[PDB]
Amino acid sequence: DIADLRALLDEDEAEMSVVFSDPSQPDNPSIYVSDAFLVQTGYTLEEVLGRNCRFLQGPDTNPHAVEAIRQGLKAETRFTIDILNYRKDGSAFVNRLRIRPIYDPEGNLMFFAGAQNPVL
């Protein structure tokens, strides 16, 4: 039996590119990625599940934006950042990335939710 991770999505996220990660696993890997994510990025589920989402970054991604995300995750707070991301075919797009922490009833950090929106 498989956990319905999508039952933890916000209303805005249902038709969105969204990723859930497990920060209690080494390197905070994705444990769920929506079909919209896979469509936008050009990957199959097998290519990305269980990997840290940094594979979306590429040669012109700003390293300070990457460090900003890393510190935002450590802060365990809601944040949004515009970051240059890349599809499997090498094409680049500005990604408005919104991340929020999700806690268990004890109050321990449980998951991160990250929603991607191409900036048009």
Ligand X SMILES: Cc1cc2nc3c(=O)[nH]c(=O)nc-3n(C[C@H](O)[C@H](O)[C@H](O)COP(=O)(O)O)c2cc1C
> Closer CB to ligand X, residue 9 or residue 99?
99
Contact 54, 7 (CB under 8 A): no
Query: For tokens 């929506």, what's the residue?
Result: 34
Element (H, E) at 40: helix 35-41
**Interface with a copy of itself, residue 3, by CB under 8 A:** yes
117 is in an annotated binding site: no
71 binds, among ligand X, a copy of itself, none (CB under 5 to 8 A by kind): none
Q: Of ligand X, a copy of itself, none, which one does residue 38 interact with (CB within 5 to 8 Å by kind)?
A: none
Minimum CB distance to a copy of itself, residue 21 (Å): 11
Is 102 a binder of a copy of itself (CB under 8 A)?
Answer: yes
CB of 46 to ligand X, least distance (A): 18
Largest pairwise CA distance in the chain: 42
**Binding site annotation covers 28?**
no
Contacts by 37-46 with C-beta closer than 8 Å and gap 24+? 37/116, 40/87, 40/93, 40/116, 40/118, 41/17, 41/85, 41/87, 41/88, 42/87, 42/88, 42/89, 43/88
Ranges within 72-101 binding a copy of itself (CB under 8 A): 100-101
By C-beta, is 10 or 67 nearer to a copy of itself? 10
Is 53 annotated in a binding site? The answer is yes
